[PDB]
Design an enzyme around this catalytic site. Structure first.
Site, short mmCIF file in Angstrom:
data_model
loop_
_atom_site.label_atom_id
_atom_site.label_comp_id
_atom_site.label_asym_id
_atom_site.label_seq_id
_atom_site.Cartn_x
_atom_site.Cartn_y
_atom_site.Cartn_z
N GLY A 8 34.42 -63.07 1.38
CA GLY A 8 33.63 -61.97 0.95
C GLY A 8 33.03 -61.16 2.28
O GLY A 8 34.01 -61.26 3.22
N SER A 11 39.37 -67.26 3.78
CA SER A 11 39.15 -66.07 4.61
C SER A 11 37.57 -66.78 5.06
O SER A 11 37.52 -67.58 5.94
CB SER A 11 38.93 -64.87 3.78
OG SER A 11 40.17 -64.61 3.16
N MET A 12 36.52 -65.94 4.77
CA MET A 12 35.10 -66.27 5.57
C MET A 12 34.79 -67.73 4.86
O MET A 12 34.09 -68.38 5.59
CB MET A 12 34.17 -65.36 5.09
CG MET A 12 34.05 -64.20 6.15
SD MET A 12 33.87 -64.84 7.81
CE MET A 12 32.65 -66.24 7.34
N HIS A 71 43.26 -65.52 7.40
CA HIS A 71 43.82 -64.38 7.43
C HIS A 71 42.92 -63.30 8.22
O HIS A 71 41.94 -63.75 8.89
CB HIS A 71 44.13 -63.61 6.15
CG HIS A 71 42.92 -63.20 5.31
ND1 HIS A 71 43.28 -62.90 4.00
CD2 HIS A 71 41.72 -62.91 5.54
CE1 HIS A 71 42.01 -62.31 3.52
NE2 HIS A 71 40.99 -62.43 4.27
N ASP A 84 48.28 -63.45 4.99
CA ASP A 84 47.51 -64.57 4.26
C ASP A 84 48.21 -65.67 4.58
O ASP A 84 49.41 -65.80 4.48
CB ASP A 84 47.48 -64.30 2.66
CG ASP A 84 46.63 -63.18 2.31
OD1 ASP A 84 45.96 -62.78 3.20
OD2 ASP A 84 46.73 -63.05 1.14
#
Lengths: 190, 189, 192, 194, 193, 184, 184, 193, 194, 192
Positions: free
Chosen positions: D68, D97-98, D122, D171
């Protein structure tokens, strides 16, 4: 079914316009008013002495647009005979009433309704005031117009238009909004 | 979303113990009535101690707001008012309506005054009725501001004809407040 | 997931949510958009903490993209008005009114964590109406623009003109860059 | 007048003691779902709280998140490095991701995944509409962030920068064993007993 | 509205929601969709129960159409990780991830009530973008599909080939069928049987 | 609409003095019927006009304009129901030329009292109620006149929806004949 | 109710007699259509008067000023006639007709006011747009003053808020030269 | 509704829409937004007029807030490509791509009526996705911005530096100002002056 | 009773002769805007029509398009190769994705751009939701299409395949001169006279 | 952009749209979704062209993702019923009912352009109601499924079981592959 049919050498409305018949049908707005006006001006240039037959079925609508038809009815050279073929309400009644002296009709089952103007505004007190003032003028003017074409005194038009006042055709004749109520083409005139 | 809790009180209830009431956001029936109730409570607890009514409002409904204004005048306590953001329209009237000498703003506050806004649709007779009414309301709001500011009625009319934005120092000069306060330690008072 | 609770054993039991529990440690958060509701709730905590102790510092943690300037400027003023020093700590983003609040913390006591993003800009606004009213609101936002530039000039030590030049478009800064500019005093990575 | 126990609070202010409150007593903190200002700030508060309770006891930060907001998430990452206590991280479903950044951000040797978890790394995603000037401002800014997040992942995984860049261009999904081989985590763990 | 039950902690007295009361008997529910919210709540309860006692059985009641695979696999992995045996009980529906959770309960302790519906299938997903990225996500969902088939094979005792064939499309089973298949160990009708 | 350039299908049939009211009665559909009737009149004032109806009714004022035009014009307006004649649609069917109100066998015919609606001050509510009651009275009276039935019967029989098949509509005097084939 | 034929449509017939309507909102479409007609009429005969009939509540200033300019640019005198409403850009176009050739029917409403606008964004950009609309406000006031014979400061005072005038008031004020009750 | 005009092609007789009638006098309008639909129609008219006669001037009337850059640059390039000189006339608004089109008309033949508004600015765009792709699109819009500034510089006679400075934000000009700036060659008030 | 002239038809069936009809007389055909089944089929019809009128006269296919449906567009490409007449292509604004394919698909030496045009090449975009089986079916299919479109661009540009693959992995914007250097077009043209 | 017009000079003038003009060359298109409107319009053209000349081939160009099976099967039957051979030519996509129509063209006269995509699949449907009605509609679509598989078997020459196996999931084919399968007769790249 629903679209304008066509004739030999034209839609139907175009064929009837050839006999100087003009329809106001449905709501009075800029589009509908302008079209009647184009039609009155046109019939006048085709023959400025022949009568025009303006057939009305309308609930009224926009005052500025309708008062254009009204003004144009008075201005042009031909007499504009009106006939109510369903409803003549609000601006629609005014236009009926506005037809040439002696030449305003209604079919027997039509409905006539007369009232005071509706309007509406939102903003600063100063502008609300501007707008209220204006609608009160227009209210007075439209009552003055009905008093002229009806024969009624002003105060009578005022009291009778404080609320929606509905009338049948005979009642509309009696009141001075129209001159004749007609039922069969072969019948004698009154 | 979440009001912090202290001791068992919600943070606004705990500040209410120090006679501080907030108007925050729009004036409407809900938010006005909450201030009115807090003012009636504070008077009930002690009709002689000052009440501190912190205002940050863009204004809102005049009927709702005049109930607060009247309640501030009606109750025995002096209602000190304090601008902590914005005091516009009914907001600035409430701020100006605080106790003589006890109307404050923080330095960076914006205060805006204007004439009433309204809206009606229907018959001409009823438009006339509602127009007359909002004109009476305009005149009385104006008298209310002349009274508390010490400006002429003509001057208020003229300065409220269109949205009029004032900084804290200008609002003081005008009479809408009495003092601009930057620091709790500093004078006067 | 919603805010948890801590039970405190009393002489029975007492419940606090985590933020209520941290408020006891003089920690206040501004998280997300600055509006009337968020600003006011910070202001109440600030007044509360002053009342509990007028002399002990407050720790005001900031993660905000900004928002409504009038709401934010109440918080900024409240920060200066009260007696306690309000130390400010940027913990993600401090943008727009968020960067003003960060910058207005007490001298020497303005902090960022190392990966925070700090952004400064001129205000945003909007009005539709008569040219007369457009002019009134345009004059107003220009006066607001000037005031906020003067606030930043004051806390940073930069010349006002530098602020003006540097906020004309969005200006993103890393923590070390924000320190060099005078928006904060210290970048901190670890508690000892 | 003791505090009611529920499985889960309906509202932040509810005066009830829930399962999450129970586990926060054991120094367990969850990031569940999207990283946004709300979810990230709740983690931060709980980490600062735990540190205040005991600065020298491990914290167990259980992560199931698709990521996010990068600024929200980087406040979590920072807080985890800033506090005195070690923050052990455990993937319990997804770390993307985060989310994967936070997991790989755990304390040295204390980064875990349960066996079936999906870990994905990513490059950052953004979006801006406006004048060309402002587009260039935002593009330059996301490029610096991209580079900063790449350096973080290099630091914690032991990969060099140019490998992180190559492997995050698109990704990149990894199973738990793969994430351990890559240095995103230290241990894959299957049962408490081993 | 959730009913409340008041117990004398002596204390003197504490209110539980009906669900926290049943938590005291090491009962935990998955009801409805598997998603991050439902999965995490379950995983919190499991971890809590293990902290209360790491040796006592836990009774995990399942009524779910499935949902997200990552969320549900957290639950699965937490079941296997914790010390207690997690008995599973189907109480209406166990479909998709629901049935994987049911089948992953402790050996010999997977139950269904007699009218439950158990359904197994292959995963669902989707993606839009560049062909390169379509490929990445496709490869990843094929890995997921395989790992989930291998889990079902492990807990059912079925060959991997049979799982693959039987999950290619929605495959609905009655309780007694699911038992025969290896997805549960017993069908139970009455407490005192 | 099937289409030669210099007739559409309706235009061709208009050349055989065939007119249609198909669907809802409203200002648009009523007016177009009125225009066609008046045109037909100008082309030959003695030949019959064949007015096919298939309609659930609609706006009373619009339709009562069509009613009135039907009575006003010289030629006989024969009515033929070709699916549904309900509410204003049955009023128009029942208004055709005496001796020349027809239905195909399968049509449905329905009569009822008027529907309306209004919101406002009591005073205005009163005004509008007063008017719909007059309209109710006036349409019953029209049905009474065209069917032979007593006002009283019409009032009882239109209080709620009254559905009739073709044979029943004839027997009742809303139509004169049920026709099944061309050869009769 | 759509446009009758006379072969032309009725507006096209009126166009041949040098009659142009602006009806309803001024926007790019409606303004361009008027411009096209004016250019065409000038091409046909550069000396004959054009009759521009207006019923408009106004609309887009830039579209409207294109019409205004074209009316002044072409060789023919463009007589203007208000036939219901002439508000904001409507009144500007009415008032911009040829000297001595501006008319209204007796019941028209004529309304003058300052421009309306708005913008959202950065303060710098709000300022650009604010200064822009202040120029447009001054230009329009100069145009009204020119055509009415009022002092600029009078125009400014009287257009600060919506100013509704009846046709006689509009004539005394100089926005028109004649009110015409009847002739042709 | 668009009015019709009937002309005696002798023939005997053909109807034109008012716009096709004016097309016979080599007049072409851009009215409203520049987009693929409006741009292409204009480019078709231009190509048509050039086929009718490659030496006669064309009169391109512009009333536009601009819009899409690719669509409008087709129009620009077609103006320059075709043999006839394309006179441009501003008849209300020429903003953004509108003003670029106005300024790209034939040298000495760019006009405005006296009340028009001419506005010049930098391009607008936007993109969302990966940082890599954000970069690609940013670089591309900066190239576009530069090329458009170079076009305005070429047709105005202004330095590239001045264009850059004067287009950084919306820059509104009156007709006489635009003429002074080099965006048009004449302001015209009356046909017979 | 001669056919009316308008600038543009309101409807497909309108009995009027528009600017596009006028130019189709000159063997000019437009693709304007999105490639979809409608726009692509109209091009095809016009190409087959022109070929029937004269199989040995050039056709001028003016392209301003961001691309769109690959199957629709590949019917255009195919038809252009199948008909006897040479199909000259001219970029007049944008040739992106399937748009650039069509432009580079023109007749040898007859592929043009006006000077300010933007030409962009990339890989195909798709999207599918469903079972993993079906996802694999659709992914395999888009990969074959990707490869086929890459081979087409290799053929017409003279680049070898591995260069087209490299240069289309991400959106690749080219100015007219660049597109000419790359072999997407043959000539950049500034005025008819040169 | 909309369909252009051709003017034909007569002894005055006549106007045709391009599709009307091609219909004169015995060319019919199916473009986009198969529904009642599209299918019916193909059927009318087909009956029209038979009436104009019962003996000369028709060229039926196909770019379709399929659609409604009952509408499509009218077109398929009409194709077999009429006297002219209907040659089919795939010019982009022929999927689902689109691939059935392509396949049902006259023997030897089924064409694709080289880059076309051809896909075959089992039908799609949907019903909600009582278990009784669900069963009725499930039986029905299974009978439809079988009929369409039998059509493909017939025109391809494949065994029905092969059709069944190969349509159980979406099966995308290139033109050369579609030829090898018997879905068309010829892949054509150039007119000579």
């Amino acid at each position: 079914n629903n679209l304008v049919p066509t004739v030999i050498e034209f839609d139907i409305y175009s064929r009837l316009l050839k006999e100087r018949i003009v329809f106001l049908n449905g709501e009075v707005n800029d589009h509908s008013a302008n079209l009647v006006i184009a039609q009155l001006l046109f019939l006048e240039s085709e023959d400025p002495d022949k009568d025009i037959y303006f057939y009305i079925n309308s609930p009224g609508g926009m005052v500025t647009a309708g008062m254009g038809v009204y003004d144009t009815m008075q201005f042009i050279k031909p007499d504009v005979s009106t006939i109510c073929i369903g409803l003549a309400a609000s601006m629609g009644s005014l236009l009926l009433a506005g037809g040439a002296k002696g030449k305003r009709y209604s079919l027997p089952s039509s409905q006539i309704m007369i009232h005071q103007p509706l309007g509406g505004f939102r903003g600063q007190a100063s502008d609300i005031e501007i707008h209220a003032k204006n609608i009160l003028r227009i209210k007075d003017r439209l009552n003055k117009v009905l008093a002229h074409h009806t024969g009624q005194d002003l105060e009578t038009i005022v009291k009778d238009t404080d609320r929606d006042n509905f009338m049948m055709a005979d009642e509309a004749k009696a009141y001075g909004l129209i001159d004749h109520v007609i039922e069969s083409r072969e019948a004698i005139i009154k």
